[model samples]
Target: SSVQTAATSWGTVPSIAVYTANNGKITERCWDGKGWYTGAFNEPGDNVSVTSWLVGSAIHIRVYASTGTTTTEWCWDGNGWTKGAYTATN
Candidate 1:
């Protein structure tokens, strides 16, 4: 499933954020309604918060993987379908 962010504008910039979760992957994308999508997303990841944010025109996506409450930080930005976050095996 996915959803468009419930935001109207960031100061003067029209903004939007879209996210999805499927096949053990959490994907997100954003745009400022200017040039193009800001390209801020892990696309597909595991152990994500099942939620994310966009405090402003700036986009922020939370994604994680691996086994441990130890908690690690993974991030990405710009262009194409990025490999994103998390590691997996069966």
Candidate 2:
């Protein structure tokens, strides 16, 4: 059997960012505990995995990639999804 580990927060409220994958799609929703609020997404293929972290205070990112090599990266700029790059890492 296979196991998957998900965010334990279950609505702990992101200090900066949060992400998830479902039905072959990857999505990101962020809250910076200030005034920042935004969301992100990916296209094509099944979302195989995701990685998220904060670069600094006022900044964070969500990286989601799929089996088709489709990659989606995002950063919330206290407004909306900005500095986005969609490409294959491989």
Q: Give the lowest summed-lDDT range of ten residues in model 2.
A: 2-11
Q: Residue 29, candidate 2: how far off, in angstroms?
A: 5.6
Instruction: Give the lDDT of residue 13 in candidate 2.
Output: 48
Error of 2 at 5 (Å): 6.8
Q: Relative to the true structure, how large is the alpha-carbon lDDT of every model?
A: 0.42, 0.45
Q: List the residue pairs that clash in candidate 1.
A: none
Candidate 2 residue-wise lDDT, 1-42, digit = tens: 232222312123445444455565555555555564445444
Task: Report the number of the highest-lDDT candidate.
Answer: 2
For every model shown, what is its TM-score relative to the native structure? 0.35, 0.43
- Poorest stretch of ten by lDDT in candidate 1: 2-11
